[PDB]
Design a protein around this ligand. Structure first.
Ligand code: COA
Lengths: 383, 383
């Protein structure tokens, strides 16, 4: 084998997360949003938006789009005026810059040298460019120019699971390989003024926030330097039955526009157990309540119905609900925060593993397709 | 290992290509192009465009944008009027449709069942959508809903090499895995009226054409059932020094806008030997003239200077020049055609291998970065 393969399973070797500094309280967002878009007279619409915010499960979100930025780019504050170029001017720098913030933290925890990074896997939903955010991230961090890159533009909310799936095969098939798995999201491509005829707009405006997470992934950890946090044992995905059209997203002259023509929480709840039953098997099929649950917090409804359908104890979804609460829906980056939050809860409560006492757990994303992405991890001991 | 790995190197097991039916002869293209965009008064510009066409090394190209289609979508015939929406209406269907035509041919040559495809790796430069072209192709072909997908939107011309690099790790790390490696391009997202303000555009308008290629990639071929055409032994890439901005692409309200710098052939030719010297080593560093050369035909100047710098014999670049001649630059798909052409030339001339008698060869792409992508292949014997 002309490029020698690695021996052990892929491991998460370090985690880093990052958010823009400005915070937006959900209890105050309807006034700010409808004012900055000059729609404050639309009382009935604002009341509807408030209902959505009140049901969202979100306390605050981080966003680069401050009052100053929005006043400086009025095109983004319209409903459908052509604005894609001013949108890309914001996200082309912020998306890799935020990723670099998170990547420095992940490398610090890992303990290795930046010059030993061999691969980058990068997901986003926030605009596109040539060369891509992967290339920018390599420059910002001063990586070696021979770094091997996989740039997954335009994924939607399953992309965090995607980067860990791809990193697994890259780390497992290349002796010595150390991968940066990256997901970074900035809401400037999707932001727009509220409208009575765009209800999916209303929901996105209540849910989406900014953030980035990156993991260092690698097989065969050097014992004198590297400490694995999680092992990756299985990765797969499926398209759910009769889900055509559930989530559509079109990049247009006015930015990214979503249309949701099916019951997404219902589609996932009705189908998740059959597929999760398959993922369990290669690790001996533990019971749902013997596992940890790093679930993408697309919204409170999806977390609730999965909790009920599987009869999970209330602590299982707490990691996900914490992230929803403090950061909202950061699209592909969210699930990376969730796993991190489960690790932190484990340390704070003195559990025996970094999966809150459980040995195996799920790392789950979903999005357009309707696509369900699932990985199975093993948690390290908490020493 | 909870998902068992494969044993042998990844193999190309079948090849398929496809193009839209309409043909555009290069010697007449300046008349048609300047006609249909109502630019016939720009005589000086048209003379320059003809000079480019005559030096391009291109005899004809295939394009979906026929006279009737262009007349029916007048926004695409403008310089900068907003047109991204009707452009995406074309490429969101045509890009996967073209891929499906090439994939059927590749699957027929492979001989396996479509239900045994496990993976899709998909590159393109022709717009974006959610769900992606990968999902559309899975639907059109009737693949399993559990197919694992990697969608590299917005790669530029190195993406053909990219999909094979990714396919290598996916096939080598998964026992029984059979991957569809796909690259598909349609020029409707980049086409626009010629202008004295966008001379880079003139070169793009002379070079780019439509096409798609797909390879079946897999390790461990079942003897007497599957016949490998090439083995993949090495894959790497590098960013060339001081080449920021050589190739740029931004997706805007008016479609995709490229920047192409006069230095590109020089940047590649002045650096390629140094890197290829390294890629050679894991297979024993064969001599340049003992290898075959599947090189992305970005332009005639690039092929010419690489041939000179490396002192290659005149037959080494013929495969690339054939593809340039008959199809032009089909961005990420082009190099997939080149390898297929080298196999056909081998058979036609009765060579001893499918690499025109050589044992090892390069599969080379380049694009925004400036990124150089290289794989090292071994050719099968010619029985
Ligand atoms: C385009 C190409 C065929 C030009 O042919 P050539 O043999 O170099 O001949 P010339 O230098 O006379 O070029 C012809 C004309 O194109 C112009 N031209 C070439 N490259 C240009 C560029 N990047 N931008 C603008 N004009 C360009 C020249 O200035 C010249 O104009 P002129 O007739 O008014 O002097 C050749 O330079 C080439 O293959 N370039 C690389 C293409 C490329 O970058 N690949 C696409 C993406 S990888």
């Amino acid at each position: 084998r002309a490029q020698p393969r690695a021996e052990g399973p892929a491991c998460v070797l370090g985690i880093g997360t990052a958010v823009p500094p400005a915070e937006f309280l959900q209890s105050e967002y309807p006034d700010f949003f409808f004012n900055i878009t000059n729609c404050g007279e639309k009382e009935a619409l604002k009341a509807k938006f408030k209902r959505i915010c009140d049901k969202s499960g979100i306390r605050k979100r981080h966003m680069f789009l401050t009052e100053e930025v929005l006043k400086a780019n009025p095109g983004i504050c319209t409903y459908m005026e052509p604005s894609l170029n001013v949108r890309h001017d914001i996200v082309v720098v912020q998306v890799p810059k935020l990723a670099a913030e998170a990547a420095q933290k992940a490398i610090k925890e890992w303990g290795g040298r930046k010059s030993d990074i061999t691969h980058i896997v990068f997901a986003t939903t926030s605009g596109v460019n040539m060369p891509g955010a992967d290339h920018a991230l390599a420059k910002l961090l001063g990586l070696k120019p021979t770094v091997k890159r996989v740039m997954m533009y335009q994924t939607g909310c399953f992309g965090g699971a995607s980067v860990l799936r791809v990193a697994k095969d890259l780390a497992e098939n290349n002796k010595g390989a150390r991968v940066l798995a990256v997901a970074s999201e900035v809401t400037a491509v999707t932001y727009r003024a509220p409208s009575e005829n765009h209800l999916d707009g209303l929901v996105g405006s209540a849910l989406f926030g900014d953030g980035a997470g990156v993991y260092v992934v690698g097989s065969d950890p050097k014992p004198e330097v590297e400490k694995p946090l999680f092992e990756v044992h299985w990765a797969g995905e499926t398209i759910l039955p009769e889900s055509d059209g559930a989530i559509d997203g079109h990049l247009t002259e006015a930015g990214l526009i979503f249309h949701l023509m099916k019951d997404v929480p219902g589609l996932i709840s009705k189908n998740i157990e059959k597929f999760l039953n398959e993922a369990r098997k290669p690790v001996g099929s533990p019971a749902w309540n013997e596992m940890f649950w790093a679930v993408h917090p697309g919204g409170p409804a999806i977390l609730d119905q999965v909790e009920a359908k599987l009869k999970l104890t209330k602590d299982k979804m707490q990691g996900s609900r914490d992230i929803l609460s403090e950061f909202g829906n950061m699209s592909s980056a969210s699930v990376l925060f969730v796993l991190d939050q489960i690790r932190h809860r484990s340390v704070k409560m003195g559990a025996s593993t970094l999966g809150e006492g459980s040995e195996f757990g799920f790392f789950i994303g979903f999005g357009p397709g309707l696509t369900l992405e699932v990985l199975v991890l093993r948690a390290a001991p908490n020493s």
